[PDB]
Amino acid sequence: VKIVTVKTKAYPDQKPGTSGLRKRVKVFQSSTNYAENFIQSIISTVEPAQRQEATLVVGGDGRFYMKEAIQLIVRIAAANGIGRLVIGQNGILSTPAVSCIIRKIKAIGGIILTASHNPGGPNGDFGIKFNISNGGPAPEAITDKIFQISKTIEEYAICPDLKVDLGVLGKQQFDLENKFKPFTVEIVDSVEAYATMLRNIFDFNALKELLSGPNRLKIRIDAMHGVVGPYVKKILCEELGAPANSAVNCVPLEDFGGHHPDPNLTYAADLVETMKSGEHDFGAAFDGDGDRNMILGKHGFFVNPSDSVAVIAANIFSIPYFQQTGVRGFARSMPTSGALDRVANATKIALYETPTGWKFFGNLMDASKLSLCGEESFGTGSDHIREKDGLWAVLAWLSILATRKQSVEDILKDHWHKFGRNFFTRYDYEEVEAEGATKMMKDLEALMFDRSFVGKQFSANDKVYTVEKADNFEYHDPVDGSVSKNQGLRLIFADGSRIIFRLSGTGSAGATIRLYIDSYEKDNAKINQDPQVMLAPLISIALKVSQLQERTGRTAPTVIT
Fold it and tell me: Would 321 disulfide with which of 31, 201, 206, 403, CB 3.0-4.6 Å?
């Protein structure tokens, strides 16, 4: 094969985010050298002398355009000097799988091809997510160096001619012009090292007895035709012996079957109506790249992502991996509820509150300060890898069910009766007109920082909301030293009830108003009723303290999660 150089005109908008360069498919396929240029930028952050002894792990969630994009990574990685590429078979490799392989084979980094929950197809999204040597996402320091290069690029190296076969397992060797070392591509099974890792984490025998045996937990797993499909079939059906019909939508489709891979009650409605009938005992779903998870009990019983990390924390020793490794720290993102904190307090194990997004988690896990962690955005994880893991949260749940021999609903009533219930909901108030939102946060800040603000009692119908604290939350990272300022408006009432405001604004379309409400409760009687009734005073109070409709006109939430 020959190494030929292509002259190129650089780009203004290729700024990689904390989740890599995301853009609608059209940008990639119609814009001359868009992809080619970004791939060559990623590769160019790798210093020349290290290219030969290096192995990059490549692979994606399976959406449209994944394939010739991988074929681009190959020819550019090859001309560029990269010694070896370990690609999942047929390009498939889930996000938790790509971290697990990087970490395992001691690779320089991976190049995951996933637009995560954002849809796929000809007119849907795409994206090049770069991860680094520890298996986690590239840090700001690295993402921006990719940015400085994407913007100033003149020419990229390529082997036009080179075309590997993604279906065939095993090693393929190619000879590059005037190069004394061959370029090695290596096709790995997509599920094997990942299931091998899971095998030493969990007790697959206890589980096999639970899914196969006389008592047979009748589970229902929907994979929304995303990357987890193979992994669900292989690990739950073949190895654990789950009846083949337990796995729904487990075949990788390019457009995810014309739908959104978002694991939430709204988007994964199909699974939820099927779960309503009562046959099944357990249900669960995952997003695009499968590092997110939705847990469901008999008849549809929604286990809130916040309460969930807290249940796995309150039964963590039921898992073989925690019993031999030890739990050296608990953690969550600030908008996520206080349920994990009622568990974390009971123990002399550290608890960290952090801004939204894995790097925060990642840094503590590398600093050996965190073992189990969660998010309210349907995210759960541990230090076993360096990204979140959908399927690992479902299996931790099945291991608790196996040890406990209780239904999911009873597990939550026991949790809320020993720990107390943090009622939680989330109001997504989509895209508003800039000027109001900015004002409301400012008036509320002026109101919240007042000399007479704290100590004051607020009320409506039942509970008295005495303000014990107030601020606009910022974080000082203990590891890379960064300070993430103004992360969210915080309202803290003495019993534990909170209200968080998160303004994800864009000088492009408009600005998102996120209303997060954590309402704690400890009464034996008040706990078992519905959250919308139990949170209602605190929901209106949020509107009466912020004076929400007053500067926006918005009545209802676009999405309730």
Answer: 201
Rounded to whole angstroms, the Cα distance separating 57 from 188 reads: 10
Residues 221 and 324 in one domain: no
Q: Could you list the residue range(s) of the whole structural domain that residue 96 is in?
A: 1-197
For residue 450, say whether it is annotated as part of any ligand binding site. Answer: no
**Residue 372 has which token pair?**
């189990």
Note whether residue 561 is domain-resident.
no
* Amino acid, res. 412: L
- Gyration radius of the chain's alpha carbons: 24
Tell me which amino acid residue 302 is.
F
Q: Judge whether 61 is annotated as a binding position.
A: no
407 annotated as belonging to a binding site for a ligand: no
| DSSP class per residue in 171-188 | EEEE--TT-SSPEEEEEE
Resolution, given in Å to one decimal, reads: 2.7
- C-alpha 50, offset from chain centre: 31
Q: Is 246 a catalytic residue?
A: no
Residue that terminates a domain, selected from 374, 400, 426: 400
Q: Are residues 80 and 213 in the same domain?
A: no
CB under 8 A, 24+ apart: contacts of 301-305: 301/408, 301/409, 301/412, 302/265, 303/408, 303/412, 304/337, 304/376, 304/424, 305/336, 305/374, 305/375, 305/376, 305/377, 305/378, 305/379, 305/380
Number of domains, the chain: 4
Assess whether 366 and 246 both reside in one domain: no
Contact predicate 431/513, CB 8 Å? no
Torsion of CA 228, 230, 231, 236, to 10 degrees: 110
CB 470 within 8 A of CB 453: yes
Residue 558 lies in a domain: no
Is 497 annotated to bind a ligand? Reply is no
Instruction: Using the 3D structure, point to which of 160, 182, 197 is the last residue of a domain.
Output: 197
Q: Do 443 and 344 share a domain, yes or no?
A: no
Which of 192, 109, 197, 133 is closest to 389 using CA atoms? 197
β-pairing, 125-130 with 4-7? unpaired
From 116, 150, 308, 399, the catalytic residue = 116
Both structure tokens of 121: 């197809």
How far is residue 100's CA from residue 442's CA, in Å, rounded to a whole number? Answer: 44
Domain of 318: which CATH number? Answer: 3.40.120.10
- Is 287 labeled as ligand-binding? yes
| Token pair 């990269």 in the structure block, residue | 82
Q: Using DSSP, state whether 219 is helix, strand or coil.
A: strand
Sign of the alpha-carbon torsion through 377, 378, 380, 385: negative
Torsion (CA) 427, 429, 435, 440 in degrees, nearest 10: -10
Experimental method: X-ray
| Domain assignment of residue 560, yes or no | no
23: three-class secondary structure by DSSP: strand
Rounded distance between C-alpha atoms, residue 402 and residue 120, angstroms = 36
